[PDB]
Design a protein around this ligand. Structure first.
Ligand SMILES: [Cl-]
Ligand SMILES: [Cl-]
Ligand SMILES: [Cl-]
Ligand SMILES: [Cl-]
Lengths: 101, 101
């Protein structure tokens, strides 16, 4: 579901992802997602506009916009958070990546 | 380079991709891309709005918008075509996938 955050069932580079696909775009068996990285050991120079900072589990995470990819529903684990309150920053980051605006 | 089409140097599910990242968004060592699939053996019901039809090498291809992903520059092979003349349909497909508009 768009803007919900899930854990991966299989080992991946990151441990959470946010679903960014529209809820009226049907791709059977898959969803387009963006991984979230723990902010703790990342560069302080990472653009906040392209890589928004969000809060889950009492810590900070960066949305790894440029590591967007689709996953099969078989890898979609437990839902751990909802980022719909950060739609503006998420939309801005995605649009920046393609359109530089 | 945005809207240029390249072959993969390593075996992938598809054999061409289009670079869709902005040319002023720098991700060192990587680019965001969308694979192209040969249209020949695909369903005739596949949405043209979400999966545009383009022409390369004297055949038709579908832009596999929902299989968008980043690749390392090490996998970027020869440039085989430029799809900048299809920017309107490419932009429409990408925006549809996230925003349903
Ligand atoms: Cl991490
Ligand atoms: Cl947040
Ligand atoms: Cl193919
Ligand atoms: Cl074309």
């Amino acid at each position: 579901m768009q803007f919900k955050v899930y854990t991966y069932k299989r080992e991946s580079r990151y441990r959470l992802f946010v679903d960014v696909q529209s809820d009226i775009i049907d791709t059977p068996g898959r969803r387009m997602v963006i991984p979230l990285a723990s902010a703790r050991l990342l560069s302080d120079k990472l653009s906040r506009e392209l890589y928004p900072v969000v809060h889950i589990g009492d810590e900070s995470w960066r949305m790894m916009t440029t590591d967007m990819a689709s996953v099969p529903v078989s890898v979609i684990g437990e839902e751990v958070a909802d980022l719909s309150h950060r739609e503006n920053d998420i939309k801005n980051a995605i649009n920046l990546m393609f359109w530089g605006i």
